[PDB]
């Protein structure tokens, strides 16, 4: 599977990682990012999580975390690629989301973002 | 294999303008988009995959150095190997170039092997 | 560039009457970039720091509205960039050519700020409009609010100076000094008190933004550890 | 186990990591954080420790450590999730706490912090 | 063994890491910090080293190293926990010290340090 | 072996001016070009390979320290071992010196082993 497979992977462009959380679930480190538009336009946050030891997106965890941390400490415009309906732990899902953070790209200028996109 | 091999192309006096990270197949990957520091030309895109191709051993060092050069906005020379990634959707999306080397470019010359 | 932005707590009336004034006479570019000449340190910078990025304005508003000790309204003022507005990068390159040293911390911080410095006071004629930054507590996000149009704006259609800041002080020997930052790696020069807050004796009394050293943050993100 | 299990995991919101310590105990690297209230109000500070080779929270030791470091570096207002009565080494407990640092999240003013919480 | 065993572990408080050295000895990566009293040239410099593959303090080598680097970047007041008579290589001892770097804590304000102390 | 041995040369009061990273025969490698502050000439190039030579264990610590010193531009002492790399193309491209040590040089003295 691929971060850029737009059929099963959604993405929100020109986001800012506003909130960062790290924790452990079922013996695995995880981090969740809450992202919003820089301006108050969308009004609903995108919550994307990444678990180090579960789901098919575990291998990218370590890099994604790092990139996420960068985008969290600078609030650089970021396109966030998420996989919906990944997490199944009901308390975890009710807390954050079912969205798995699967990709991050920089968004230089407000018109275009780097990385794979829809046709 | 070597970053300074004849099959390796390089582009000097570039600045990493765009950074993308994701997962392809079972490997974490990171692509960079670099433009000429003297604003001109077509952007170079090079990607590295953590568990694909012969450039696996340098993936972590390349990711760290690309992150450093992207954050500092340094003028760098990018060493790529063309025609490494074969997945077509990945090729149109980012590139087929494998990021195999990074060096610092100064106002006069850049470090690293040359052709 | 044209139409840089600046975040100020004073209402559009005060700024449209007075504009922005220089804190002091410190022309040194290193002290400006590291924030020593700004509100974090010496507080006598001879520059008014603005950003061409609207996202940096949103980040500044986010930091001030999230510190939770700050009370009052914030406004983004949209300033036309005349020939007295200079990008940091050409002057930094000139200072480096003149024997100065800017470490990777300063380079990264400058790249993050998208900074443009006005060597003169920003006159009210250069300010297009003030957009109120409403901080609703429901979702904790900053919304662009009422847009007040300045009636003293001239529309000279000027552009920022692409050259080097004139009369730059001689670059001092590098000492690996602290870089003042607040919020998410926002340079301390973007803080409220980095510009002159006195207005005909009516000095605004708002929360002093605490500044952390940006070097450990830049090191943390450069090397993921 | 999960960072968000509020029945067994406690948390203090709007804290600032004021003190950072690293060391080794019983063949394992550990770090402890002393956190006070972000407002500066009168409150006993919370000490939370994480040991790289002890307890069930070892898998999240690294990710927390880096995160804690960043939260210590920027003095960012944070919510700390701890597990009470984890460490049993008596000199260690007397020195720092019984609390195991199990999670960190960003706090965006008011009372709204990212991450799990009590309803 | 524990960083906080004040019976066998010494510490100097309110130091700032002034010099950093890294290298390799006997197949193991090592680093050695030189710390002076945070107020000028006071006292004698403490030299403490950590070897990645030698002595009982190897498991913390990475974490301490990271912390040391951060404490080197900020130049902030820190407490250094060392174990004396750990290194036995005579040229190595004559160069740096016998001291093994076993702990690092942040020292916030004029006088008060985080971490274990002598009663 | 030790960076303080007699077989190890060192150059003090250096500043890392150029940084290069790449891959060489399944080994991640990085090379640094350091110059005397104020430009006394003859720049010194030192490389480290992740999976070659006896200096394998210190590759990661040396890479992080070299990155930190390049970021700060701080005056430092470089400990090299001559005649470690033998690949002729690699030798002429960068050097044969193996980067085996790095120490902070704070102007009065300079940390680390001496002669």
Author numbering:
A (entry chain E), D (entry chain D), E (entry chain C): 1 to 119
B (entry chain F), F (entry chain G): 1 to 115
C (entry chain B): 6 to 230
From the manuscript:
In this study, we identified and characterized a typhoid toxin-like A2B5 toxin, designated diarizonae toxin (DiaT), as a key virulence factor in Salmonella diarizonae. The DiaT genomic islet encodes two distinct B subunits, PltBd1 and PltBd2, which exhibit unique functional roles. Through genetic and functional analyses, we demonstrate that the heteropentameric assembly of PltBd1 and PltBd2 is essential for cytotoxicity, with our data suggesting PltBd1 facilitates toxin secretion and PltBd2 mediates host cell targeting. The holotoxin consists of a pentameric B subunit arrangement supporting a single PltA subunit, with the amphipathic C-terminal tail of PltA extending into the central pore formed by the B subunits.
To elucidate the structural assembly of PltBd1 and PltBd2 within the DiaT holotoxin, we introduced a C-terminal Strep-tag on CdtB in the S. diarizonae genome. DiaT was purified from cultures grown in TTIM medium using Strep-Tactin affinity purification and gel filtration, followed by cryo-EM analysis. Ultimately, we obtained only a single class of high-resolution cryo-EM map for the holotoxin, at a resolution of 2.32 Å. Despite clear visualization of CdtB in 2D classifications, its flexible linkage to PltA, mainly via a single disulfide bond, caused a weakened signal, leading to its absence in the final 3D reconstruction. To distinguish PltBd1 from PltBd2 in the cryo-EM map, we identified residues with distinct structural features between PltBd1 and PltBd2. Specifically, Ile25 and Tyr82 in PltBd1 corresponded to Phe24 and Val80 in PltBd2, respectively, providing clear markers for differentiation. Detailed analysis of electron density maps revealed a pseudo-symmetric arrangement of the pentameric B subunits, comprising a 3:2 ratio of PltBd1 to PltBd2. Three tightly packed PltBd1 subunits were connected with dimeric PltBd2 subunits to form the heteropentamer in the holotoxin structure. Pore radius measurements confirmed that the PltBd1 homopentamer exhibits the smallest pore radius with significant distortion, while the PltBd2 homopentamer displays a larger and straighter pore. These findings suggest that the specific positioning of Tyr70 in PltBd1 is responsible for the pore contraction in the heteropentamer, which enhances compatibility with the C-terminal tail of PltA. The stronger hydrophobic interactions between PltBd2 and PltA, along with additional polar interactions involving PltBd1 and PltA, establish a finely balanced assembly that facilitates the stable accommodation of PltA’s C-terminal tail by the heteropentameric B subunits.
